[PDB]
Amino acid sequence: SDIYQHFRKDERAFIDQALEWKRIVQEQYRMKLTDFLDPREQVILSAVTGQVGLAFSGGYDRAERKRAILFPEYITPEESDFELQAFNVRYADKFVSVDHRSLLGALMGIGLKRQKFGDIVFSETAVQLIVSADTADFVAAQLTQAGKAAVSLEKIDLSDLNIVEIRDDTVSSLRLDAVCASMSRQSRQKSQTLVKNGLVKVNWKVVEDPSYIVAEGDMLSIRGFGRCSLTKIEGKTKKDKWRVTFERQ
RNA sequence: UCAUAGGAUAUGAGAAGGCAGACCCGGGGAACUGAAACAUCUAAGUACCCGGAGGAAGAGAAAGCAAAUGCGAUUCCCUGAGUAGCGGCGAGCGAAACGGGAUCAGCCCAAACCAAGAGGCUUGCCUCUUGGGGUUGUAGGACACUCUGUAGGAGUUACAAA
RNA sequence: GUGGAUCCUGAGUACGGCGGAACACGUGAAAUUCCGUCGGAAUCCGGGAGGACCAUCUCCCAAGGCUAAAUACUCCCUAGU
RNA sequence: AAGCAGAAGAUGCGGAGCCGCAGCGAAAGCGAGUCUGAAUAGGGCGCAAGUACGUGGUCGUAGACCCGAAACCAGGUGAUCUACCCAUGUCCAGGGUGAAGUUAAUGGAGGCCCGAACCCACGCACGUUGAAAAGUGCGGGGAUGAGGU
RNA sequence: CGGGACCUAAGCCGAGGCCGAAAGGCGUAGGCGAUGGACAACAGGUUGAUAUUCCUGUACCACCUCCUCACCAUUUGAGCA
RNA sequence: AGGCCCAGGCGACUGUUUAGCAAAAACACAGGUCUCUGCGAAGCCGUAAGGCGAAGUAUAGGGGCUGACGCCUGCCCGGUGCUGGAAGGUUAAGAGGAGCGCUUAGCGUAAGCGAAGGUGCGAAUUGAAGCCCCAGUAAACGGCGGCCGCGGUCCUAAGGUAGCGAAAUUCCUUGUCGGGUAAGUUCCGACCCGCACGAAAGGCGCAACGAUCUGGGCACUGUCUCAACGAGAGA
RNA sequence: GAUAUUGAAUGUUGGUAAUUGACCUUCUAACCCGCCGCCCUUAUCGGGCGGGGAGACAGUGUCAGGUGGGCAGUUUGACUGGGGCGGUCGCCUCCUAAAAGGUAACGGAGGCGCCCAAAGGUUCCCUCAGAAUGGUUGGAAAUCAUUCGCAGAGUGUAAAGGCACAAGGGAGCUUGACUGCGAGACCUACAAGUCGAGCAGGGACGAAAGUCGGGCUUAGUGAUCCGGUGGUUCCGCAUGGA
RNA sequence: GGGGCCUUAGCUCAGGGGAGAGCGCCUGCUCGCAGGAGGUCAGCGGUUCGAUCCCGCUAGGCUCCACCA
Ligand SMILES: [K+]
Ligand SMILES: [K+]
Ligand SMILES: [K+]
Ligand SMILES: [K+]
Ligand SMILES: [K+]
Ligand SMILES: [K+]
Ligand SMILES: [K+]
Ligand SMILES: [K+]
Ligand SMILES: [K+]
Ligand SMILES: [K+]
Ligand SMILES: [K+]
Ligand SMILES: [K+]
Ligand SMILES: [K+]
Ligand SMILES: [Mg+2]
Ligand SMILES: [Mg+2]
Ligand SMILES: [Mg+2]
Ligand SMILES: [Mg+2]
Ligand SMILES: [Mg+2]
Ligand SMILES: [Mg+2]
Ligand SMILES: [Mg+2]
Ligand SMILES: [Mg+2]
């Protein structure tokens, strides 16, 4: 009842379902695996669950979309309890490239919901994808094309997963509109339009307040400029102005 | 309901209030001031208020002082000594014992136990009330022993009281 | 006076924690004394003190009571300086 | 010294105690030396007339040469003045206006109007060792009210 | 006549009682307390000085019974209350 | 036994106030609004008992602000307050004793080791409100921009809406123009470069009301030109 | 919030070997009732008795944390061409300063609150700035070479006084940037501050003489109280320890 | 008048070792792109081998004071 105030109105939908997962694990005494929750939904679930203990894993370490196990004070989980299947994406790499957009578009095109897959890993040697095991055979059978590339999926173990733009700058304040204008290299009035409309995020939360103060180590996501991180804040310079370090993806 | 609360009556040289503007013992307790300011601290447990007294009060017969081939209740005086110490180690506060004097005095219980009676029988146990018994420290007492006294000694200032 | 078979010798006490006060002694190395609060002994093969504390030794026997004198003071009365 | 005896005296007794005769060192301690230091060195401090009483000067603690605050604190005394309240009384000449309601009339509302008593205190003058430690005179405001007493 | 031997208001006091280092604070029963309620005397005269107070005349109120008269009644029995 | 009139500021009004230099534009007020308060109410007095609140009960009671009436009351919740609250962080006494010191029966040629007890400290762990933190809230405390050419740009929590404006606010200032006068630093009406108005510390109006403040008229006069004489009180 | 007053059960979850904790719910009997009936009793007080409500909570005590101008005691510097505001406050150097020393003003100029393990000690050796003339890059200015050249440089750093038998530059070896001190001086109200030959211990460099107790000199610092750490033939409240 | 803070390209801004972003503007381009322009670093003298940077002055502008009589 008195949790919704701290989150967004749209985020209420997830919080209701997050409470329903906590309802199970307390009363019934069993682990509840979730369908790959978004980076934001990881933060929300962490709060809603409370301290029912919580574990999270999206296959490899540093996955955006991860599946969450809600377990009690016993039955500490394993890697395979998350029910993750990795695949190597096979294609005629010498003749066609697969990009992240094409592969993401193809996964969505076969009707796969965003919650049924984790990260899409691009290395120098491999293109790999992580899905929920319950959808593995469907994805392997249906994902036959990504963009212009004919593709096939080879099952691999999670152990076989083949897992910056440093920009020292100054800003007058640590407000969202100020930091965005500096990062994106725009006028502030234009940057305020990005925030107010609801295009900027801060750690995957849609911040619509221009005056929101940005902390050290916050993933900002300007729809237009992509994604970027305030990594270091190193005090004020001469004539005020915070020293800051930006790192675009 | 038994009761008890309450009510009534009788007997009380029972209390009450005052003051000597003093002294004494308690309850409560300032501030100015000093510290060259000020808060700890000081002034001060003072002034003041309150309670209780008594001709005095308080203290008093070692769970003491001490560190000797010791002392032997308390109180007060001299001295120790403005020492030891305490202290925004500042301002200041400040002993005690030993030693020398005044004065001198020591006692009664509680308990064990005994006897008698009473009311709870908890049913030969327990609790209570009288009288006896008993009074302390290199322990004493009960308890047992054998002694011994029951009228010389003591006394209304404690040690019973007219 | 002699004996140590048993029994008795002051309990919500002593003491301790916490908070205060009193001790010349301001929380200090702080004994000692008292108050509130809470906790809480041993009981003679026992207990206390000797300025934290322990051991040894020494001195003592608390948690009941009474007790003159030496001391203080003078509204008064008498005599006097 | 207290104390005892003695005129409230002198004085006698009283040697506990006090200061001095030895210092040096934080101290154990050593001693005409001692401390520092490894040191027979060097250096520091010492070595090589006090005391009891009296008068006087000054100082300390006391109000401390005298007079003087504004203040602070403690315990009392005051609401016979005044502020507000409570209970109970009482006062307010006269005139005017004319709400509601009722059937133009009737009716008689009001922190209503004019205006004495009464209450107040706006202006000016006078008074200013006053008639008066706040008034008087001429005007002024309220005057059935949140009224006066 | 005004006040008391009548009544109560505000308030005040307050047996027991409640509360509080002490002193005390509060308060019930019960009282006290007019500025209010109740309550029988008037006119005239008089002194240097009092007058519903004295005097004259004419009244009224409460209470009393040595008495008088009438009426009612002695346990469903007057009457008082 | 009323002087009257025109126009403006302030306050709606009758009231109230600095006994004894201020009666006013100050206070109050009806009305508005916010907020607290479920009754042993909140609030208040008292150490308490006992009370007021109230012999009341949310159409009631307390507190804050505003101040008839009319039209209205904009933007900002970053800060502070108030209300509520999820994760995460922090935090007392008390609880809890892992360890350690001192002591010494014993043990050791000594040096030193050292049981048990006593005693002196004591770490982890546990530990509320609160705070950090999050959300809301402006008739809560408050705040309502610069610079450059309606646009840009910087900055902010957000940059002053309506209305008003040289004002009880305007320094410059006797602003400027008009009115009124022979002549008007005052007054009235506009203007707006508001030094430094502005919406319940309300904004703007506003009939009635005022021993209010302000400007102008009629009437009237020894106030004056400019004094004279007379009466009385004192001299 | 803990703890006392403060009890009984049922669950559940700790920690010790079946007792004791933690928390949840329930109970009634403490505690509470500004609720009703009855009695004391003519009584809206109080008390008793019986219902009811609530209940080991509350209240109250002790202890603890938070909040707390509601209230209390206080502090809130001095200099100063009046005070406020501004500036300043200690140390070093120069000038004022009148040829010893000292000397004031909110007089005139600047520095300091360090730095260096060599930028210290010693032994040995050395001479700088700049210019002229010549030079592939290369220039006014890098690097040579020549001559001239009291210093026109350098000296960690402000300034003054010094310094070329160098106190300036280079190299080797070192730690005297020593311990105990100290005749005697300077300065000085005191507290402090400064210089010091020389003696002893044990060293460094040097063949030796000798020099060395930091630095060319003069700033680079802060009393006491209190507390920490290391050392210690000291004390240790009966004695041994602590 | 006294303190304080500023003055970088046309504009806004980076910063003891030699002045850069982005914008404007310019180029040629199929309305975003490639590349260029633009600097007494407000003025000055001096500390330094070097100064936009330290240091002291000097304009100009912004902010706050200019009070007691
Ligand atoms: K004081
Ligand atoms: K003083
Ligand atoms: K103590
Ligand atoms: K205790
Ligand atoms: K003893
Ligand atoms: K000597
Ligand atoms: K002599
Ligand atoms: K003398
Ligand atoms: K004197
Ligand atoms: K007023
Ligand atoms: K005029
Ligand atoms: K002057
Ligand atoms: K050398
Ligand atoms: Mg003083
Ligand atoms: Mg007596
Ligand atoms: Mg007597
Ligand atoms: Mg006695
Ligand atoms: Mg007797
Ligand atoms: Mg005894
Ligand atoms: Mg001892
Ligand atoms: Mg006071």
Ligand SMILES: [Mg+2]
């Ligand atoms: Mg009185």
Ligand SMILES: [Mg+2]
């Ligand atoms: Mg009175």
Ligand SMILES: [Mg+2]
């Ligand atoms: Mg009227």
Ligand SMILES: [Mg+2]
């Ligand atoms: Mg009168």
Ligand SMILES: [Mg+2]
């Ligand atoms: Mg008046």
Ligand SMILES: [Mg+2]
């Ligand atoms: Mg009138």
Ligand SMILES: [Mg+2]
């Ligand atoms: Mg009468």
Ligand SMILES: [Mg+2]
């Ligand atoms: Mg009373």
Ligand SMILES: [Mg+2]
């Ligand atoms: Mg009584």
Ligand SMILES: [Mg+2]
């Ligand atoms: Mg009367």
Ligand SMILES: [Mg+2]
């Ligand atoms: Mg009558």
Ligand SMILES: [Mg+2]
């Ligand atoms: Mg007469």
Ligand SMILES: [Mg+2]
């Ligand atoms: Mg008015």
Ligand SMILES: [Mg+2]
């Ligand atoms: Mg007045």
Ligand SMILES: [Mg+2]
């Ligand atoms: Mg007046």
Ligand SMILES: [Mg+2]
């Ligand atoms: Mg109450």
